[PDB]
Amino acid sequence: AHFTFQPEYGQTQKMNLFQSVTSALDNSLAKDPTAVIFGEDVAFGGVFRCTVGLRDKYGKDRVFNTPLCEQGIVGFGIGIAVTGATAIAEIQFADYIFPAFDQIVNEAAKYRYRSGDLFNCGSLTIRSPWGCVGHGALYHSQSPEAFFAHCPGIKVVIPRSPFQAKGLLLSCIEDKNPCIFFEPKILYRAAAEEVPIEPYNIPLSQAEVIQEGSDVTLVAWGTQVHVIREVASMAKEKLGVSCEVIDLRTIIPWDVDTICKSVIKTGRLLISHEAPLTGGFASEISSTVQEECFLNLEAPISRVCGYDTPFPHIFEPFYIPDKWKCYDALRKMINY
Amino acid sequence: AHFTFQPEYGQTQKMNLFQSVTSALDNSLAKDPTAVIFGEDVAFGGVFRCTVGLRDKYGKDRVFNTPLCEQGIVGFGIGIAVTGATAIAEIQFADYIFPAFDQIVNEAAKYRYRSGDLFNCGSLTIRSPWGCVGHGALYHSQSPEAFFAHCPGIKVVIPRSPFQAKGLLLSCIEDKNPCIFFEPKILYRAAAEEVPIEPYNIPLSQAEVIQEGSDVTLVAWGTQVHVIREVASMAKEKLGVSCEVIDLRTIIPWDVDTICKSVIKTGRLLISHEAPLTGGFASEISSTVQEECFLNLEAPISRVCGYDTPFPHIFEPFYIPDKWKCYDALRKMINY
Amino acid sequence: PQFPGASAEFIDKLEFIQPNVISGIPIYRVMDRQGQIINPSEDPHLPKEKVLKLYKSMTLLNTMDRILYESQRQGRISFYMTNYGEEGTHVGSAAALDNTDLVFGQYREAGVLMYRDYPLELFMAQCYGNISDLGKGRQMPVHYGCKERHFVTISSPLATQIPQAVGAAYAAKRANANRVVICYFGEGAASEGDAHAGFNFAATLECPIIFFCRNNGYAISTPTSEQYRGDGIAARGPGYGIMSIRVDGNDVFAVYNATKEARRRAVAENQPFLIEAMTYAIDHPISRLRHYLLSQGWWDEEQEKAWRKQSRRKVMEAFEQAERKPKPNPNLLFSDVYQEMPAQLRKQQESLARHLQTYGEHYPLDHFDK
Amino acid sequence: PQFPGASAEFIDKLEFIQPNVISGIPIYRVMDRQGQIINPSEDPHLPKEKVLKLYKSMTLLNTMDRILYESQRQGRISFYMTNYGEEGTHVGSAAALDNTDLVFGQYREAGVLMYRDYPLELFMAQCYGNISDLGKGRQMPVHYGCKERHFVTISSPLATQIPQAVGAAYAAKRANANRVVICYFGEGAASEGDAHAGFNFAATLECPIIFFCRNNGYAISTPTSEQYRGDGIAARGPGYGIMSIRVDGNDVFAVYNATKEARRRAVAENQPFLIEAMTYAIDHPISRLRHYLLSQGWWDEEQEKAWRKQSRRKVMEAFEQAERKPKPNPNLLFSDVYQEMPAQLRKQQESLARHLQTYGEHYPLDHFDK
Ligand SMILES: Cc1ncc(C[n+]2csc(CCOP(=O)(O)OP(=O)(O)O)c2C)c(N)n1
Ligand SMILES: Cc1ncc(C[n+]2csc(CCOP(=O)(O)OP(=O)(O)O)c2C)c(N)n1
Ligand SMILES: [Cl-]
Ligand SMILES: [Cl-]
Ligand SMILES: [Cl-]
Ligand SMILES: [Cl-]
Ligand SMILES: [Cl-]
Ligand SMILES: [Cl-]
Ligand SMILES: [Cl-]
Ligand SMILES: [Cl-]
Ligand SMILES: [K+]
Numbered sequence A, B: 001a002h003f004t005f006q007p008e009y010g011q012t013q014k015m016n017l018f019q020s021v022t023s024a025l026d027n028s029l030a031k032d033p034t035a036v037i038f039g040e041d042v043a044f045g046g047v048f049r050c051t052v053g054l055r056d057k058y059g060k061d062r063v064f065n066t067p068l069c070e071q072g073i074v075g076f077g078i079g080i081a082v083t084g085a086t087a088i089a090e091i092q093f094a095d096y097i098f099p100a101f102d103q104i105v106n107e108a109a110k111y112r113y114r115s116g117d118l119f120n121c122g123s124l125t126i127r128s129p130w131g132c133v134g135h136g137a138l139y140h141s142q143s144p145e146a147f148f149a150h151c152p153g154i155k156v157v158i159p160r161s162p163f164q165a166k167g168l169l170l171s172c173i174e175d176k177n178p179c180i181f182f183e184p185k186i187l188y189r190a191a192a193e194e195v196p197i198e199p200y201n202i203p204l205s206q207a208e209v210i211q212e213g214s215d216v217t218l219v220a221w222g223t224q225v226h227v228i229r230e231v232a233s234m235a236k237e238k239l240g241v242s243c244e245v246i247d248l249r250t251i252i253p254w255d256v257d258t259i260c261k262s263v264i265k266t267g268r269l270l271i272s273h274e275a276p277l278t279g280g281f282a283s284e285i286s287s288t289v290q291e292e293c294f295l296n297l298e299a300p301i302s303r304v305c306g307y308d309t310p311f312p313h314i315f316e317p318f319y320i321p322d323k324w325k326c327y328d329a330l331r332k333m334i335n336y
Numbered sequence C, D: 001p002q003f004p005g006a007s008a009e010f011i012d013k014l015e016f017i018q019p020n021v022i023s024g025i026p027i028y029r030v031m032d033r034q035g036q037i038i039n040p041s042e043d044p045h046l047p048k049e050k051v052l053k054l055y056k057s058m059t060l061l062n063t064m065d066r067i068l069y070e071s072q073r074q075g076r077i078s079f080y081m082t083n084y085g086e087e088g089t090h091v092g093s094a095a096a097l098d099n100t101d102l103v104f105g106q107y108r109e110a111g112v113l114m115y116r117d118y119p120l121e122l123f124m125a126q127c128y129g130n131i132s133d134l135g136k137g138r139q140m141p142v143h144y145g146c147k148e149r150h151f152v153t154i155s156s157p158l159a160t161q162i163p164q165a166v167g168a169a170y171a172a173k174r175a176n177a178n179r180v181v182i183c184y185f186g187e188g189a190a191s192e193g194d195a196h197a198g199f200n201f202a203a204t205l206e207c208p209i210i211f212f213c214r215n216n217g218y219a220i221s222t223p224t225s226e227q228y229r230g231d232g233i234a235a236r237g238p239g240y241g242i243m244s245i246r247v248d249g250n251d252v253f254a255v256y257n258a259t260k261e262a263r264r265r266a267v268a269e270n271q272p273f274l275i276e277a278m279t280y281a282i283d284h285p286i287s288r289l290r291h292y293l294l295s296q297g298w299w300d301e302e303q304e305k306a307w308r309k310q311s312r313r314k315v316m317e318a319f320e321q322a323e324r325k326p327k328p329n330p331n332l333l334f335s336d337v338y339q340e341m342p343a344q345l346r347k348q349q350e351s352l353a354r355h356l357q358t359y360g361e362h363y364p365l366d367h368f369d370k
């Protein structure tokens, strides 16, 4: 495997990431009688098990299958939400969100603005499996967040763990704005961690500094947080370099203040993501940090990203911005 | 109006931008017997007149109306192109390209790669009206280029004038890769210029330095080139500042070398575009220039872009990155 | 034959199923062009007050259209779509709904609002983007919306409202609302992928929705011969399992009757209905209804003249007031992007205010509020 | 009735048109489960060599499936979709095409390739992403393609190939090709917006295309009761003006006959045809054909045994060779993104080569070519 997963709210239970999604969804349906969950194959529990047991517990009218039509799924969800009801749509793989792109970008995102707040689809959340999985090739690997980051009026949120996933998904579901929640599918069955049984929230638009450091700031999200955590460890052991490791968590609106404050301290930034470099979200972070922290920068901001190709099958091990790529970039940046 | 339009190949004729598109299309159909043009309302000459006379000249089998379905129009075009025939699809407003997003991003862009070059849709071009028009509000104003810039396998091209439009459109039509050509609709009937009657090409992935300068590099595309040309004039007269003015022309793949060479000389860069700031293409240019020209930068790279909202109706004059906004940003940057 | 996908016999000869397009689904009509009821069993016998409201709503819409169309030709407003030929489809269907049934539509639906007593002042406020506009001047003209009157704000992208209308209907089912959703769209818009989505979802998910397709034979320049090759839109409904009918869109009573029966059954059965109303893209709904009124003794030329005058005055008073109002505060360009305003969006707003403090003479500040 | 959108009479009574779903379009069948021809006028009388090729193509596919399914369960390959239950729809339709008719499909179409003599070595090369793969190892297993055999490379996103197939057909019309395009998709995929696009465009643009919908009653876990409410996919065709038929997908002769007649008419008339083949999601096409062979005196248990053995050997020889081949040069991750390689993409490739020179011990370099 290319990563290693490692590491107040009442009773907890060990949960993997799919279970933690199920738990968030269950808590949501229990406390919100309007809430419904729908999409392709969600009734029998979903192709990644995220809705197991929910239809039996809550009823066929609340956990149900749609026809095979992503533009429909999203338009339908918007419609539920326009009435004030909580609509939790599933898109089976993030790779298949694009049919719904017009509904997301021209409708959901603009719904409140264009109506002067007479109508909204704030109670809509779209969740979808995301990111590489070792062998998913072009259409089971994609990381689409940068496509949505250019669209004012939607929130895009990506967790790094089961604890984070449940708190962030609850916040998406309860947030008064249409949210896309991308679930890193490689983590669904990876290692478990303790997750509270009862509902709790992790705030949107807030990055989390998971390790403090003074020489360089490393920023990522999803599975890639675990890659940069390992890179921090490699840098410490091999170079005596102290790395501040930050999980961005929310892509938009993003936590500009946390990232800038870190870079003012360290004077160096490396941003990493599986998505292709060109037009990737790292370009927005780099641009912004350069604008706010120009005088503090000791070296050029580094982006270690996937290459500007479609996501390959047999070449995946050569494509991903792995720990060795991140490490080397960091080494050069420190030597600048 | 918010802009002013101003300014070897055989016989020329004065043409506005729509006429120049018509002329490119006519030349294409004359010399390529496979070429067909299709989309909504193209048969009677199009809602912006870009196909006037073409059906009468070339036949109903070559210039024809489709049903009202953008996902169909693009899928259909891909299909024509898979056979080796030239397919020139029209999307009526760029704002309505999003239904076709899955066909563009998951199909057209990946067609060659995923087949190992057994199949391709290289002979596909999608042209669409683009950019603000003074009163187009949410759905007749959009600049979608940054959404497509994150997709390896497509080319995105935007002209600033009738001469440029015809040469760039011919190159898109003849290029062996699926191209999106965005036509700045505010220019369709604005001022004419001399355009060659016969076919000619302007290269893709090449920026054009339209005015040489030594104090600051200004970069834009489309109508915004005319805004920065005026800003250069304001800077010279009011501040004694020499501005190097660059039309990017091709969004992807973009001419990194031309922009970096300019910034190595001037030490300052301001990038401007009508599209919203966050996730806009200026972030890619800023990031990259920072990476290549770190030691040459005398000041933070400026982005003067539209705000991070949907494109408004009555507030348009306050929304656009006009000459005064660009000028002020430049003033501050020079004073840094 | 034991196949899960379909219920059918075997057949031992090869036979393709042919479309029946030359002999299509017939066009339901209640009154002829002289305003006479053809079949008394089909008379809705609407009371005089209601029939006059239908007539006045249709003619007031037409008066508004004339004034605002001219305003657009002069560039006083930036865009306008008229309702000519669609007055009867919209007022007749609206009259068959309950006042709280939620409406989705697009560009030809102003008559639904007019029937529901939407103020002339607010139609005009939207078209002028003035301070009275509850849409805060953000959308192009004729993109109307009213929460109070259950009329979801129009958007330009065609057919997007179709699967949305279905979701709203599904929600109303769950709420045990005894409410229907109606969704208007043209025959061109029916070519969009989102129409297939909406039709199919409404059927499989058993939603109380009326699909109301206006077929006027054209989508901008495109005749229906280039739009589809089956028997209009009505003939698609059965293939989705949707109860369907075609009606004469120049006959308010045909439209009313079809809509009233669709509404009754949709709410009771939780099943979608499709109505395809045949109109002309522009023997008019207003004339036909006028002949009906005369035959009952319910109108005359004196009333016609006085109403023409009164309605022109009401429209001109609203028009003049609308033109004189200021536009909203430019600060409103930044609100409602999200419910709350993100800090980075507030920063852009502050950047605008700083810019206008220095460069304000170059902006139309005197036309905008505060 | 003078309406441009439709050809129809008036009707003076209100009547909704009902779907006929309980008595659907009948299922065309040529032979019963014991392999007997039901109606001699429907016998295609295919010659013995061809019928044996149908049989052997179907059983070789099934043998391949068994071996590769197991390989996937063991993680030797990363993904696999079987053809079980779909052998007859694919081989029977493929046999009715001209060898140069262009095929678009997705995941259940390997039998078309097998019929067209695609080498076992190349099916396996794609599934292993090895050096022999003309797709250069870039796509997931079973995403086959062959230019030489006019079989357009499969992609994962469902229904995208439908409007593409229509464009290719339009192009073939213009080329005066005397060529058809066939487009395969499942009943689930037919719910996508792109299926509505494709169907409608083929009709209005008059394209020589056969739409071949496999209806096996399920899309992953979703039964057709949750997928649609009309009478399968066949009943949608007439609403688009498309000639339609339903066939028994376990009967190679029914499939062949429907496809052969659709092809004949599509090329001649420039009009689309829809075939909906009813199958089982997994009284099998191979058994039925086997009974037919026996009744003609064309096969026996000795031949069955020897072919089973020979085909297992051929598949195992290809499987073993495929597993032993190296994967392609990692440089191939960068080519064919565009036709040419942009300079900035070459820079990324050079960056990879520099990285592997230093960190190469951490990568599986010994498994990849050069
Ligand atoms: C997705 C999209 N594509 C194109 C347009 C441009 N457009 C505005 S109206 C129209 C024709 C619509 O025809 P129809 O639905 O039949 O309604 P009608 O105008 O005839 O009432 C078109 C193509 C649009 N608004 N949205
Ligand atoms: C656009 C998209 N959405 C979802 C998927 C995931 N998916 C792969 S196969 C399948 C079911 C397809 O059903 P059907 O078309 O009936 O074909 P069958 O598998 O029954 O042969 C789904 C939903 C996909 N590949 N593409
Ligand atoms: Cl007037
Ligand atoms: Cl429009
Ligand atoms: Cl006044
Ligand atoms: Cl000025
Ligand atoms: Cl085995
Ligand atoms: Cl899949
Ligand atoms: Cl070997
Ligand atoms: Cl290692
Ligand atoms: K939400």
Ligand SMILES: [K+]
Residues within 6 Å of the ligand: B122, B123, B124, B125, B172, B173, B174, B175, B176, B177, B178, B179
């Ligand atoms: K091209």
Ligand SMILES: [K+]
Residues within 6 Å of the ligand: C105, C106, C154, C155, C156, C157, C158, C159, C160, C161
């Ligand atoms: K709409």
Ligand SMILES: [K+]
Residues within 6 Å of the ligand: D105, D106, D154, D155, D156, D157, D158, D159, D160, D161
């Ligand atoms: K596909």
Ligand SMILES: [Mn+2]
Residues within 6 Å of the ligand: C186, C187, C188, C214, C215, C216, C217, C218, C219, C220
């Ligand atoms: Mn129309």
Ligand SMILES: [Mn+2]
Residues within 6 Å of the ligand: D186, D187, D188, D214, D215, D216, D217, D218, D219, D220
């Ligand atoms: Mn199926």
